[model samples]
Target: RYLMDPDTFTSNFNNDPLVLRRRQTYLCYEVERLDNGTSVKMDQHMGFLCNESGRHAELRFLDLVPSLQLDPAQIYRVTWFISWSPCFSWGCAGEVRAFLQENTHVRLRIKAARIYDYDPLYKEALQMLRDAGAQVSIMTYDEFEYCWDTFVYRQGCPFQPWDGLEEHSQALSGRLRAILQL
Candidate 1:
C-alpha cells in the first residue's frame, strides 16, 4: 500500500531539529499521467518505499521507476513525499539528476519532510537537483495537510499541526529558498 502510518509521517515530517527518532527515511510516491494541465489515474506502480540494505531511498526509487515502463511519448509527473531530502554526501542528487536528464518525459518533484543535513554539501546537492529541473522543496503546512489527506492511514483523527508549526515550516522554507536563491 502507498499509505503510511500517521504517527510515522508526523514524526519524520516534524521540523524540529532537536527531535530524535527520525533516523530512517520513508518515501511515498505517486506517478500520474499528465493531460493538458490535468492528469489521469495513477499507475499501480505507485507506492511507499524506504532505504534498505545500505541503499538510499532515492536510489531505491530510481531502481523501481524503470520497471513501470512508462510511455515515452506521454508526460508523467512523479511526486515524492519523503522523510528526508536526497543525501548529497552519498551522491544521491547526482544520480537522480542524471535520471531526470535521461527521462525528459517524466517531471520529478520532491517535497521533503526534512533537509537531511545542514552541511554545505547537502545545500549544493539541493541546488544540483533544482538545476536539473527537479522541483525540490521543503514540506510546509499545506504539504503536511496534503500528505495526511493523500498518503496517511489516519485511522480517525484529523490532522492537527503541532505547536510552533508555522515557524518551523517557515524556517525550513526560507532555508530552501536561500539555497535555491529564489
Candidate 2:
C-alpha cells in the first residue's frame, strides 16, 4: 500500500530547505535484482537498497502497477502503512491490530520494519523516473483495509490472523485490471 501525505504532495524541485526538512517528503531511491552487489554508496540512514545491487529499478515505482512501462499520464503509487505511526491509524481496523496484539510473532514482525522518510537520494531517483515519464499515485490506507476486508469476504474466507493475507491482494489485482483495461 502506498500512503501519500495529502497536505502537499508535489513533484520536482524549485525546492526549499523547508521541503527537505519534512519527514514524509523525500525522493526515496531504491533498487532490485542483481547477482553481484555494486560498490554504490548510499546513506546508512535507512539501510539503502543499492548498498547491495540490482537491474532496472530506483525509487517508488508507484505508477508501475500491473505493468513496468512508464506512462506520463499515469502516476502509480503503493501506500505502505507503518504501525504505531500516524498512517497506521488508517490501517488498524478490522481487528487488524487486535490480531497483531494477540499474536506475538506478527507483532514483532511488523515492528522490525521502521519508517525513514525524506532521504535525499529519492530526489535524484524519483526525478529520474519522472523524466522517464511516470506519474505518482497513491491509495488511501482506509481504502486498502476496506478493500482487503471485502476481498476476504468475497473469497468466502473469514479474516483470521492465522490465515495468510496472500489472497486478499487479488482484490487490487482485479481493480487495476479494470482500470488498465478501460
Candidate 3:
C-alpha cells in the first residue's frame, strides 16, 4: 500500500509535474475465461452479459467515473486493489473498469465476489476511499443473479459487504479522497 494524497495527485496531473508520475498502478482483471468457455461483458448502461460452460468464473471491471467537480486532467494516477476466490468456482477472476470525465461523476464497475470474502484488498480499498470522503456505491447484481441461478441451476445470491448501502457509500467516499488526494 503506497498511499498518496488524492488532492496532490490531481494537482500533479493537472500541472504535469514530476509528482504526477505514478508510483504504483493496479492491474485490470479480465473476466473472460476461454478454457471454461465463460465470458462476461458490461455496457455503459451498467448491463451485464455472461456466457458460461462449467463451474469456472471470471470477474471484470465494468466502468469507473469520477465526480462532476473532479477534473480528469488533474488525475495523475489511479490504482485499484482487487481480490476474489477460486473456491466457489474454479478459475474465478476479478476485473475492474474505471470511467473518467472532466467535472462529472466517477463511476466504477466491479466483477468479482459479491461480498468481501477471502479478499482483504476489497476492504482495504474501500477503507482508503472512506478516508478520502469520496462518494461510493457497490452496484448489486442480485437481479442478474436470479437469471444466472436459473440458467446454471445454482442458487445465486448477491452479497452485500456492509450493513447498508449508505455505509459503504460513505466508506467509499473516504477512500476516493485518499486515492485522489482530495
Which candidate comes out best when scored by lDDT? 1
| Per-residue alpha-carbon lDDT of candidate 3 for residues 75-143, written as tens digits (9 for 90 to 100) | 222222222211221222222211233222333333222233334354544444333332333323342
**lDDT, candidate 1, 48-78, per-residue tens:** 7777998888899999887989999999989
lDDT (tens digit, per residue) of candidate 2 on 42-153: 1221211111132111122222322433233422222222211112222222133343244222111111011222333423322332333333222233433443342222
lDDT values for all models: 0.83, 0.26, 0.29
Considering summed lDDT, which 10 consecutive residues are worst modelled in model 3? Answer: 24-33
- Taking all chains together, the TM-score of candidate 3 against the true structure is 0.23
lDDT of model 2 at residue 47? 17
**Among all candidates shown, the one with the greatest TM-score:** 1
Instruction: Tell me the spans in candidate 2 whose CA falls farther than 4 Å from its real position.
Output: 1-119, 146-182
Candidate 3 ranges beyond 4 A from true positions: 1-44, 49-59, 62-105, 108-114, 129-134, 137-182
Ranking by TM-score: 1, 3, 2
